[PDB]
Nucleic acid binder design. Sequence first.
RNA 1: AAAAAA
Lengths: 386, 379
Amino acid sequence: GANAMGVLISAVGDTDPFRNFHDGALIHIARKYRPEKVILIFSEHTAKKQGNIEKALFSIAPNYEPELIIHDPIISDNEVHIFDVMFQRFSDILQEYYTKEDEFILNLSSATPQIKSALFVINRLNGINVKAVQVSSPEHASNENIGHDNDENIDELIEVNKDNKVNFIDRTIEDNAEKFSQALLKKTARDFIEKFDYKAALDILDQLSDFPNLKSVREEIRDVVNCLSKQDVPKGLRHKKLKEEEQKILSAYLTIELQRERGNVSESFIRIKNLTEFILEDYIKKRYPGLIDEYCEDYLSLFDYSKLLKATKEFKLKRTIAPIIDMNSSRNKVAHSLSPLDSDAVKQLGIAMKTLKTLVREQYHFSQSDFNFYQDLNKILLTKLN
Amino acid sequence: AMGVLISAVGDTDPFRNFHDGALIHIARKYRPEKVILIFSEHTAKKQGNIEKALFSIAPNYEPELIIHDPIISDNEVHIFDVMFQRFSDILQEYYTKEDEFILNLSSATPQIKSALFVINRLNGINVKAVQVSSPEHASNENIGHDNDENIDELIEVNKDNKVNFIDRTIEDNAEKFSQALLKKTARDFIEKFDYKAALDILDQLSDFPNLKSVREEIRDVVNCLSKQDVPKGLRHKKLKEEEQKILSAYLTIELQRERGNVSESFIRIKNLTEFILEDYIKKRYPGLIDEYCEDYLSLFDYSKLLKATKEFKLKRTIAPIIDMNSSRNSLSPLDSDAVKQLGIAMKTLKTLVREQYHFSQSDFNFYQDLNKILLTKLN
RNA sequence: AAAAAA
């Protein structure tokens, strides 16, 4: 299609078009950047000045003929000062006019603070990141004790205006929102962490400008990410109170809970069988040395362990794993098939879950606190990320 | 547990136009036990008048006044990003969970008032934030500043100096801005394929036109994927049922690699490869598998069936995946030699299905393309 | 309602 035009989106305030022998923000940005289109957002208070605005814009240079879009509806005066209302209004306005194709400029220095705030914020909250320009006061200080030129003769203001030259003094400052963009990225990293997407959180942290806590937070998350992918035990779960296999059991269990939270239900069924199998092997090797080797004159399965628990009169434990044995058919669908699970097969996972937990709680005496590893880690990580 | 007002100081404070400025008006209404004052160079000049005004509210009301150090340079007080960082730091310095804070959204430069409005929600503290409306209830154009006047005169003629003053405060609850931050979080989740986390946000959003559409789209994905089913969007009418199962299960493996969950993918790759081979043999050699089943079939069986049919190119192609059987088989950790195996099986598998089923570049891009539509609807 | 309640 056609090539990009420069479009200046701007509101209008008491300092437009001119004040104190100088350009207001709107005219100054137009004068410097010469946009082809200018979308003008008025309020009831400022609409009376529409003609003087267009006169001022066509007064800049003789071959400068900007296309002036006068937005509709204008902004009601009893809304123009409310923060949250103007945020919505200028979200709506910016979605109405933004195009990927053109090259936009936001005037951050005309109208109420609630409108200027909204423009500054939305530019980055919605990731359009167009050019955002402030215009300094010519006082380079408070405009206290400096009046408004709105009741004056427009043609005079145009003539006396000190910016009415080719070599005007540039009072424009471009915003790049470096610090604010970091806060938005950190917010995303925190959102990811709360929901246990540690890999996605780590991707954000690798692209962050440095600050004190950044390297330890990144180091803590990397170890979690790396170990979990390799199906290892993160350093944080290698409690010295626990034997090595207890650490593997505790971590493998907590990973299925993470898996459940993230909606990976079908993958849970293979993990529950493997963990239960590992726990039973561990229990039988510890309690009946040489039993498994005798049996193995034939990898053992839940069914083999069930027989061994009968042979050893381990009758409570035999009933404990019965719900996990029931979901054997569904585990088979996720392990040797592409057939889908029904909603009943799903609800099993909740039952096996409550069972798995009472199992590991009973055999290894994990505390409520031990089960809370990732929640408690998140707490500390989040505070370290502002 | 005490009430604490954080406030900058502007040209309208302490008094203007026979009325409270924002700082005094908020203090007069809410009576914070503590008031943290952030001056700039320009406004520090009237510190004494500010304190006199604050103590002039009531004889039995003495707020504890904290004069923040360092004051803000006038040459930064007007820049958006700088003032955002500055007041982000200030709020972290003073915030406690035990107290109850108030933010004055109506004193100092627009960049300072914007910073206060934004950080309150961006950073989740969500304390009370108050605007004070001009007594003109309109533009203060043509209204001067009373900073050069007599402070005692101002205090006495102040129309607000009374028990039943006109309440000009407006409490900000940032309903729309809070929704935008939730939408941004939902967008961020979608780009990274956490459809479940995105769904949980969308279930908490105030309704807007597209919401129900976007909700249903994601719910179908989350629900079908959790049951190892095929999302409706992947049931392409151009595809045989089992080709849809194959395309979906492949893309699910890709999703797990993106989310870092490599551990899962080895069992997924085996079943998908087993399913492809059985598809290929059932089509090409009718009854062969039944003949073979005279004494669930595994990769080893399909390998022998490929041998028996002299399909040696195919038997060779699936060799990386059979090699992976040691790693796919407990609770020991994968080493990095096995992590690279998965990467190769993934390329092997992709080329297999491209040959066997002729999936297009676009077909493999289902989730990326769906995210595009979802994201636009969530702006 | 440009660097200071609309």
